[PDB]
Amino acid sequence: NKLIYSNMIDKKTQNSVKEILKENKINEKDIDTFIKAVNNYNKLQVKILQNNINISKSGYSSINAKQVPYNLEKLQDNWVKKFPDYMDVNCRITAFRLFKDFINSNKKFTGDSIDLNVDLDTIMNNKDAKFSTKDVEKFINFFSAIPAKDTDDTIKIAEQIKNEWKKRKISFKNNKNIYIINGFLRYPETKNVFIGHTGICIKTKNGILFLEKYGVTSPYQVTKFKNKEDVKNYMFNRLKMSIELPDPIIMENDKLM
């Protein structure tokens, strides 16, 4: 298919994105925090990014590929060398930076949150991931792996995810054109499912705008999709770029997408 995207290198695209963010009621403080991370990241990796033909210097680019190619190995090398004491923010943290206020969480999680160890360390040591105690507990309660029954029926898994979030007293604020796309992967070895990739979806007149932190040490990417179908397919291609693995469970808030 075709991907229309921006890495938010230019200030005009950033301004554009900020407007759309502000229009959807995202806290202006969190928008600034997100934008500073974007600039701070871009500044750090500019010499690498500028050698990537697929990264736009201004406006949106286009490529007939399943994913935008990035020099993931060199980007990670540069991060580790310059910031050796902690990790960059990831998909979960970034998504949360923008969507935490649209999630209700009323239960402290004291289950198995081992999958978030890196994330939690970043939240403690990286200014880009600063969150209040309440928001950190929400983060853990929302993203901790969900117990699964090793079933390969996506519908059944989706229902277990929904049920588990209910048991954790998690709910989504209603009447919003902004929603979170959670790409769950099943891990039979640990009898659970966990959010392998995530990003925020915003419906506009042009279609749908998807925002994400491509991965830790990886670039930020904003993509313009025609419909939700392309968003689902995008998340799939991102999760399936990783021989005998279970298909992902792509959730749109608490509903199978």
Beta carbon nearer to Cl ion, 104 or 177? 104
DSSP 183-249: EEEEEGGGTEEEEEEEEEEEE-SSSEEEEEE-STTSPEEEEEESSHHHHHHHHHHHHTT----PPPE
Nearest distance in Å: CB 42, Cl ion: 11
CB 65 within 8 A of CB 99: no
> Looking at 63, 118, 120, 256, which residue binds Cl ion (CB under 5 A)?
63
Binding residues among 11-40 for Cl ion as defined by CB under 5 A = none
Please enumerate in sequence order all residues whose Cβ is within 8 A of that of 171, keeping only pairs 6 or more positions apart, or say none.
Answer: 103, 104, 165
217 near Cl ion, judged by CB under 5 A: no
Beta carbon nearer to Cl ion, 110 or 132? 132
Applying CB under 5 A, the span of 23-31, 51-59, 148-156, 193-201 interacting with Cl ion comes to 51-59
Beta carbon nearer to Cl ion, 24 or 217? 217
> Looking at 27, 61, 71, 237, which residue binds Cl ion (CB under 5 A)?
71
Q: What is the largest CA-CA distance in the chain?
A: 48
64 near Cl ion, judged by CB under 5 A: yes
Which value, to the nearest 10 degrees, does the dihedral of the CA atoms of residues 145, 151, 157, 163 take?
A: -80
94 near Cl ion, judged by CB under 5 A: no
Applying CB under 5 A, the span of 49-57, 176-184, 210-218, 223-231 interacting with Cl ion comes to 49-57
52 near Cl ion, judged by CB under 5 A: yes
Applying CB under 5 A, the span of 129-137, 152-160, 181-189, 191-199 interacting with Cl ion comes to 129-137
136 near Cl ion, judged by CB under 5 A: no
Other C-beta atoms closer than 10 Å to the C-beta of 144 total 20
Beta carbon nearer to Cl ion, 70 or 234? 70
151 near Cl ion, judged by CB under 5 A: no
> Looking at 110, 117, 132, 174, which residue binds Cl ion (CB under 5 A)?
132
Binding residues among 106-125 for Cl ion as defined by CB under 5 A = none
Nearest distance in Å: CB 46, Cl ion: 11
Using left for φ > 0, alpha for ψ between -120 and 50, and beta otherwise, residue 173 falls in beta
CB 6 within 8 A of CB 206: no
Token pair for residue 176?
């919003």
CA distance 185 to 58: 34
Please enumerate in sequence order all residues whose Cβ is within 8 A of that of 124, keeping only pairs 6 or more positions apart, or say none.
Answer: none
> Looking at 6, 42, 105, 217, which residue binds Cl ion (CB under 5 A)?
105
Q: Which residues bind Cl ion (CB under 5 A)?
A: 52, 63-64, 70-71, 104-105, 132-133
